[PDB]
Amino acid sequence: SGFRKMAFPSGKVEGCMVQVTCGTTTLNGLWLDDVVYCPRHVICTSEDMLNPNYEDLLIRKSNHNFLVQAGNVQLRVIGHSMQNCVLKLKVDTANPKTPKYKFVRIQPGQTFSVLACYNGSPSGVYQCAMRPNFTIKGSFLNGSCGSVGFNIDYDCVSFCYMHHMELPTGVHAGTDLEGNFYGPFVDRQTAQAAGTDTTITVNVLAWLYAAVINGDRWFLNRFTTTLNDFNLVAMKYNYEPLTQDHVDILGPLSAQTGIAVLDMCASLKELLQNGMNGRTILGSALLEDEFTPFDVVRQCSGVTF
Amino acid sequence: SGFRKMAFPSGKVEGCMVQVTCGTTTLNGLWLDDVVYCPRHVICTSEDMLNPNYEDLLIRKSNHNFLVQAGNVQLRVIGHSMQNCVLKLKVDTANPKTPKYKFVRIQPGQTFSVLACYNGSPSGVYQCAMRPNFTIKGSFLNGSCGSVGFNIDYDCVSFCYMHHMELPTGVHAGTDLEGNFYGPFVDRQTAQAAGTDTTITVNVLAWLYAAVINGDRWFLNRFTTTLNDFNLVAMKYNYEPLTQDHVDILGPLSAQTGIAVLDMCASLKELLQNGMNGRTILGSALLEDEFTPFDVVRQCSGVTF
Numbered sequence: 001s002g003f004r005k006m007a008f009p010s011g012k013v014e015g016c017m018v019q020v021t022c023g024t025t026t027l028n029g030l031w032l033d034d035v036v037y038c039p040r041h042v043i044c045t046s047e048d049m050l051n052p053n054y055e056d057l058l059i060r061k062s063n064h065n066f067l068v069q070a071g072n073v074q075l076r077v078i079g080h081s082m083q084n085c086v087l088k089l090k091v092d093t094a095n096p097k098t099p100k101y102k103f104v105r106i107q108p109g110q111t112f113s114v115l116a117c118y119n120g121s122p123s124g125v126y127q128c129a130m131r132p133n134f135t136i137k138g139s140f141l142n143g144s145c146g147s148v149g150f151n152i153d154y155d156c157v158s159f160c161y162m163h164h165m166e167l168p169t170g171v172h173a174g175t176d177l178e179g180n181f182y183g184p185f186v187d188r189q190t191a192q193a194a195g196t197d198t199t200i201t202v203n204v205l206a207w208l209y210a211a212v213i214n215g216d217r218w219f220l221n222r223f224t225t226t227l228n229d230f231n232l233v234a235m236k237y238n239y240e241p242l243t244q245d246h247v248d249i250l251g252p253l254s255a256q257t258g259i260a261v262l263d264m265c266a267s268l269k270e271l272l273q274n275g276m277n278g279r280t281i282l283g284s285a286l287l288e289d290e291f292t293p294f295d296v297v298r299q300c301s302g303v304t305f
Numbered sequence: 306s307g308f309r310k311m312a313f314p315s316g317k318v319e320g321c322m323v324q325v326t327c328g329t330t331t332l333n334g335l336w337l338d339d340v341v342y343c344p345r346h347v348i349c350t351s352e353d354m355l356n357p358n359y360e361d362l363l364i365r366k367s368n369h370n371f372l373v374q375a376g377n378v379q380l381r382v383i384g385h386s387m388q389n390c391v392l393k394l395k396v397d398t399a400n401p402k403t404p405k406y407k408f409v410r411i412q413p414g415q416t417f418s419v420l421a422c423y424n425g426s427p428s429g430v431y432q433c434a435m436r437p438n439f440t441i442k443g444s445f446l447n448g449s450c451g452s453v454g455f456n457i458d459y460d461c462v463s464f465c466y467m468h469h470m471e472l473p474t475g476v477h478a479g480t481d482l483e484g485n486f487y488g489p490f491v492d493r494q495t496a497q498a499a500g501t502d503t504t505i506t507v508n509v510l511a512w513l514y515a516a517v518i519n520g521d522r523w524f525l526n527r528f529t530t531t532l533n534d535f536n537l538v539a540m541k542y543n544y545e546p547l548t549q550d551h552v553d554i555l556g557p558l559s560a561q562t563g564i565a566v567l568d569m570c571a572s573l574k575e576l577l578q579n580g581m582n583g584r585t586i587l588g589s590a591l592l593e594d595e596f597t598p599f600d601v602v603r604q605c606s607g608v609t610f
């Protein structure tokens with residue numbers, strides 16, 4: 001019993017974290033095989049950030065300008081190249097701790113673990129989700145750039161996020177491991193803002209199933225709804241539209257608890273229109289949307305890595 | 306910016322998790338140096354669990370009755386002894402992945418990371434606190450016994466908890482790494498119940514200081530309170546009494562924000578009386594009590610917004 005915001009075990013990723021320095025700028029890098037991946041803004045000073053020409057700043061750099069530190073050992077940079085907003089530093093030593101890995105681009109609503117790092121050293125691990133507005137509500141200070149987000153599928157680490165910046169509202173923006181930003185953001189100190197966010201409906205429904213599996217059933221009702229009527233309601237409350245894909249994905253949870261997905265949608269409609277009336281669900285007075293249907297199944301079944 | 310329930314990176318602990326089997330019973334063990342630590346109920350069947358005589362059950366065992374598996378390798382047990390509710394199995398191989406470690410007994414209100422494991426394999430990591438009633442609100446399934454709680458301040462792992470059981474309310478009970486239970490619990494399937502729990506007041510205050518640091522002050526007021534008047538009101542909402550120790554411990558957070566501890570106590574008194582009125586504090590509609598003063602200092606910026 002119990003239901004916690006749980007992150008994947010971080011050991012396989014800790015063994016890849018390094019410190020990357022270019023002049024006065026220092027941040028984190030991800031060392032996989034003989035390449036170190038890091039945000040391309042490591043080559044920028046604070047003045048360059050205002051309007052950087054990355055190809056131009058890069059051409060002025062030699063391999064020896066990049067200092068890469070793995071623990072107490074200095075790695076020798078033998079090559080460098082840019083791919084989108086990521087810098088790839090070729091080193092003379094393959095990481096002996098390189099796990100089985102993939103680079104994957106995730107969609108809004110998907111969750112992942114973040115291993116927050118400072119100076120190439122891991123400080124903490126937390127779980128979060130790619131918001132529908134493509135930002136993440138992380139916990140990051142200056143020095144955290146290059147920290148990565150990941151999931152584990154069997155024994156394979158799927159790297160999905162690399163940290164680049166914090167927006168004025170305190171939320172975060174970054175790229176996939178191929179340097180493509182999530183969201184309409186750019187790597188420059190210019191006026192940028194997170195768009196209006198929405199709630200991840202399929203995730204709220206999944207968390208309502210985790211509450212039922214855990215003994216919280218006060219919110220269940222005798223009613224059902226159509227998918228179309230539910231979406232008319234959900235749009236009124238800044239909730240993402242629920243698709244037939246989402247309904248199919250919740251099937252296993254609908255069978256484990258005996259509550260059909262449109263029956264759980266009728267519970268969610270009543271919660272939106274009436275509030276919780278002094279009650280909580282899994283120790284929360286808000287409807288939680290950072291657990292996917294897969295996360296609920298995994299936590300309630302004890303999957304190991 | 307941001308504030309998340311953050312766990313320590315688990316890699317140092319993952320490298321110590323093993324599977325311990327004694328006949329039909331299987332659970333997790335912690336392999337440090339040449340000793341494997343595990344709950345003593347590994348020698349019990351479901352029948353034995355009502356009134357087990359651990360000394361009588363153990364004397365009937367030899368070293369070769371204990372099967373210890375580390376990854377795909379079987380370890381050879383060369384000795385065994387019981388210390389309180391923990392079994393210590395001497396093995397023929399020192400763990401090459403043994404980190405720098407300490408065994409520490411924690412007090413209620415203290416937080417720690419849990420690496421939940423099944424069959425000697427890590428499944429997830431989450432943060433939690435020792436409740437005032439000495440239970441923890443974990444996420445644990447059958448097969449999770451032997452999973453551990455820890456803190457990793459600096460490069461040393463301080464092991465503080467080993468999982469033994471789930472109480473009828475779904476909360477969890479366990480021991481320190483010397484086998485001494487936290488709380489009035491016994492490793493028997495006899496009638497046991499968690500005592501009435503309370504909110505960790507010093508932790509709520511710390512998290513209010515975190516909200517101020519991150520730039521939010523809506524909940525503050527022009528009032529102050531005496532320590533005694535605060536406790537008379539707090540205990541009416543099932544909040545733990547705030548001691549002079551707690552007030553001294555909140556000194557640094559008080560100096561960083563410019564808000565006296567008793568002035569923050571007046572704010573908490575008002576929040577308990579009025580609720581949040583549609584507002585949130587650090588993304589929560591409830592007052593959070595599982596972040597200590599030390600956790601807030603570790604996660605937050607040293608510059609108040």
Ligand SMILES: CNC(=O)CN1C[C@]2(CCN(c3cncc4ccccc34)C2=O)c2cc(Cl)ccc2C1=O
Nearest residue numbers: 041140141142144145164165166186187188189306
């Ligand atoms: C809040 N940021 C700033 O005042 C200056 N700023 C610096 C920077 C690099 C470091 N960084 C941070 C990243 N995460 C948490 C941070 C917390 C506090 C300060 C900085 C943080 C940025 O956002 C950045 C990178 C890129 Cl690709 C594009 C723009 C910027 C940028 O605007």
Ligand SMILES: CNC(=O)CN1C[C@]2(CCN(c3cncc4ccccc34)C2=O)c2cc(Cl)ccc2C1=O
Nearest residue numbers: 001346445446447448449450469470471492493494
């Ligand atoms: C809920 N408990 C039970 O039905 C049977 N039960 C078995 C057991 C060992 C395993 N275990 C669990 C530990 N954590 C999460 C569990 C979740 C679901 C079932 C069991 C879980 C116990 O509580 C146990 C150990 C000890 Cl030292 C003293 C008593 C018990 C005990 O009562």
Ligand SMILES: [Cl-]
Nearest residue numbers: 410411412415
């Ligand atoms: Cl303590």
